[PDB]
């Protein structure tokens, strides 16, 4: 299960990091944008893996 | 700070420029893959078999 867990951490952290660099947003706003982008995807991924 | 100011010195300096070239080459190759999808569909069928 290590692969799934590290993927779930890395995806969020990197996506926040990517948004922060490309758009130049502050960390909090960038995190909001990134989570808005990937929250439904994460829930669907959980359902699929289940 | 200073936008996407990746390091340009040392191992991390070389990695950042290597990866950017790698990413550009990848997104260019995918461009060439999408021009002829059918051939790679045949490749996928070969892989499945």
Elucidation method:
cryo-EM
Residues of A with CB under 8 A from a CB of B: 21-22, 24
- Gap between the Cα atoms of B12 and A32, Å rounded: 29
Query: CB-hemisphere CA count at 13 Å for A31?
Result: 4
Backbone angles phi, psi at A17, to 5 degrees: -65, -40
User: Which tokens hold the place of B33?
Assistant: 């893959």
Q: Does B10 touch chain A (CB under 8 A)?
A: no
A-chain residues within 8 Å CB-CB of B1?
Answer: none
Question: Can you give the resolution of this entry in Å?
Answer: 3.0
Residue partners of B8: CB distance under 8 A and separation at least 6: B16, B17
Q: Is B3 exposed, middle or buried (0-12, 13-18, 19+ CB in 10 A)?
A: exposed
Give the distance from residue A14's alpha carbon to the nearest chain B alpha carbon, in angstroms. 14
């Amino acid at each position: 299960a290590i692969g799934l867990l590290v993927d779930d951490a890395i995806v969020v952290v990197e996506n926040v990091e990517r948004v922060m660099a490309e758009e130049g947003l502050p960390p909090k706003e960038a995190t909001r944008k990134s989570m808005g982008q990937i929250q439904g995807a994460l829930v669907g991924i959980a359902m699929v893996l289940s | 700070q200073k936008g996407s100011h990746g390091a340009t010195t040392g191992f991390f300096g070389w990695f950042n420029r290597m990866f950017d070239k790698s990413t550009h080459h990848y997104t260019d190759s995918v461009g060439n893959i999408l021009r002829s999808t059918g051939r790679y569909l045949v490749l996928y069928l070969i892989i499945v078999v």
